[PDB]
Scaffold this active site. Structure first.
Site, PDB file in Angstrom:
ATOM      1  N   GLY A  56      40.965  40.154  54.409  1.00 50.37           N
ATOM      2  CA  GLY A  56      40.507  40.671  53.142  1.00 50.37           C
ATOM      3  C   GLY A  56      40.022  42.101  53.268  1.00 50.37           C
ATOM      4  O   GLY A  56      40.167  42.783  54.280  1.00 50.37           O
ATOM      5  N   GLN A  57      39.419  42.543  52.178  1.00 51.73           N
ATOM      6  CA  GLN A  57      38.923  43.895  52.090  1.00 51.73           C
ATOM      7  C   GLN A  57      37.922  44.267  53.177  1.00 51.73           C
ATOM      8  O   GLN A  57      37.848  45.416  53.606  1.00 51.73           O
ATOM      9  CB  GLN A  57      38.304  44.048  50.703  1.00 51.73           C
ATOM     10  N   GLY A 107      37.566  42.678  56.332  1.00 48.61           N
ATOM     11  CA  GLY A 107      37.870  42.216  57.672  1.00 48.61           C
ATOM     12  C   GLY A 107      38.751  40.974  57.657  1.00 48.61           C
ATOM     13  O   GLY A 107      39.407  40.633  56.673  1.00 48.61           O
ATOM     14  N   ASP A 155      25.218  31.384  46.644  1.00 47.26           N
ATOM     15  CA  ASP A 155      26.668  31.375  46.514  1.00 47.26           C
ATOM     16  C   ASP A 155      27.149  29.956  46.788  1.00 47.26           C
ATOM     17  O   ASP A 155      28.177  29.724  47.428  1.00 47.26           O
ATOM     18  CB  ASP A 155      27.267  32.357  47.522  1.00 47.26           C
TER      19      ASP A 155
END
Length: 271
Positions: A24-25, A27, A134
């Protein structure tokens, strides 16, 4: 402690990354081995994508939250690329596992069992004065023996006083986040309890998105009228009423995670 005294620091040579599970953005996440024989998950930080301090803060918080029901920090490599190594969970994310042939065949009894395991992990977080912020099925991992553990502590925080207030610019998933956190940025363990109620709908629907057929404006509008999520298909009414407790208007009226764990174990030992 400095990395040369820190008990979690390991030479990068002790690790072999074998299969990339995600990218992903910020890592990647890999399945690898520590000292050839121990399977572990390795999350690497993409240099420049975000603060190295912000990245490692998650590992520092995990050192303080060690419990069987929480994904365990295995090690860290503080030199760039920075690595956070954790307890490998063979069946991946709960929201993904529930959609596999094995997840689909699960009885409501085993689903209630898994829900209780999650509540048990959250009860530990609760007792230690932390919040997660989360909590959702994507952040629960499933082991090879179908036990569940809380994961992804990037937003988790130590609560000095009862509440943590996010930045006004902060935005969170509307369908999983408690109203007071959406409206005021104020988070408490009771906000996680609301999220847990939403997570229960993901469990009983084998990973369906909450509030079927509704946009976030429609969810917000309905909640403010006093409505809550429509009964999921094939949801036991006992479980639906437990979700409703999690969605009470005033945070303080919502149940504790220890209470939720005890009720779900009773539901499980009954079914």
């Amino acid at each position: 402690k400095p990395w040369w005294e820190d008990e979690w620091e390991v030479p990068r040579e002790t690790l072999k990354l074998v299969e990339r599970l995600g990218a992903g953005q910020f890592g990647e996440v890999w399945m690898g081995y520590y000292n050839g024989h121990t399977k572990v998950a390795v999350k690497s930080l993409k240099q420049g994508s975000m603060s190295p301090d912000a990245f490692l803060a998650e590992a520092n918080l995990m050192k303080q939250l060690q419990h069987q029901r929480l994904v365990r920090l295995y090690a860290v490599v503080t030199q760039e690329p920075i690595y956070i190594i954790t307890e490998y969970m063979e069946n991946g994310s709960l929201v993904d596992f529930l959609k596999t042939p094995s997840g689909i065949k699960l009885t409501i009894n085993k689903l209630l069992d898994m829900a209780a395991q999650i509540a048990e992990g959250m009860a530990f977080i609760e007792e230690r004065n932390y919040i997660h912020r989360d909590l959702r099925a994507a952040n629960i991992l499933v082991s090879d023996t179908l036990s569940c553990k809380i994961a992804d502590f990037g937003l988790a925080r130590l609560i000095e006083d009862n509440e943590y207030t996010a930045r006004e610019g902060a935005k969170f998933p509307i369908k999983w986040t408690a109203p007071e956190a959406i409206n005021y940025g104020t988070f408490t363990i009771k906000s996680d309890v609301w999220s847990f109620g939403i997570l229960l709908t993901e469990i009983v629907t084998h990973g369906r998105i909450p509030y079927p057929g509704m946009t976030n404006p429609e969810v917000i509008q309905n909640l403010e009228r006093g409505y809550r999520m429509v009964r999921p298909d094939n949801c036991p009414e006992e479980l639906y009423q437990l979700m409703r407790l999690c969605w009470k208007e005033r945070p303080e009226d919502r149940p504790t995670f220890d209470y939720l764990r005890s009720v779900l174990e009773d539901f499980f030992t009954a079914t």
